[PDB]
Amino acid sequence: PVMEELEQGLLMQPWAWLQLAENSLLAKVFITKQGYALLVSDLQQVWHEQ
Amino acid sequence: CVADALILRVRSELSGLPFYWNFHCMLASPSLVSQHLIRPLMGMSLALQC
Amino acid sequence: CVADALILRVRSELSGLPFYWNFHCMLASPSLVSQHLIRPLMGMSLALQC
Numbered sequence: 001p002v003m004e005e006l007e008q009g010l011l012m013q014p015w016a017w018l019q020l021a022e023n024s025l026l027a028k029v030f031i032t033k034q035g036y037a038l039l040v041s042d043l044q045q046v047w048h049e050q
Numbered sequence: 051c052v053a054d055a056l057i058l059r060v061r062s063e064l065s066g067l068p069f070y071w072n073f074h075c076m077l078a079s080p081s082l083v084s085q086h087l088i089r090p091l092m093g094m095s096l097a098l099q100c
Numbered sequence: 101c102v103a104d105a106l107i108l109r110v111r112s113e114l115s116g117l118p119f120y121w122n123f124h125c126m127l128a129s130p131s132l133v134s135q136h137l138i139r140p141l142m143g144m145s146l147a148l149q150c
Contacts, residue, residue, distance in 0.1 A: 098148035
């Protein structure tokens with residue numbers, strides 16, 4: 001399948017800084033033709049969506 | 051944020067037309083948080099100590 | 101561990117008598133994990149880089 005590939009790509013990727021309208025967070029995105037995986041954090045909580 | 055969730059809205063213009071997307075991220079499980087932040091951090095700390 | 105909690109049993113000889121204790125620990129909230137592991141490790145890594 002592609003879930004394993006998405007997980008591996010998300011793990012291997014580096015962190016990035018995202019500056020929103022009022023705040024900032026750390027982001028990790030891996031998008032393939034079959035879907036995507038995203039992991040965000042603000043140093044207090046972590047969210048994830050595949 | 052609505053209820054233990056993170057709505058991340060991205061709005062863009064492609065070819066001069068609106069393009070909206072929404073990430074409905076949810077709190078990550080303990081396994082993902084650990085595997086993505088905790089163990090790598092200790093690895094970097096040990097490498098820097100060496 | 102049964103379903104999601106950790107039972108940690110300490111059995112000791114208090115000078116020749118039983119001493120049983122049972123820690124019934126639940127999953128730590130995201131705030132505790134970030135406060136105790138994530139941020140301190142990042143600080144340690146930055147200090148070691150310096």
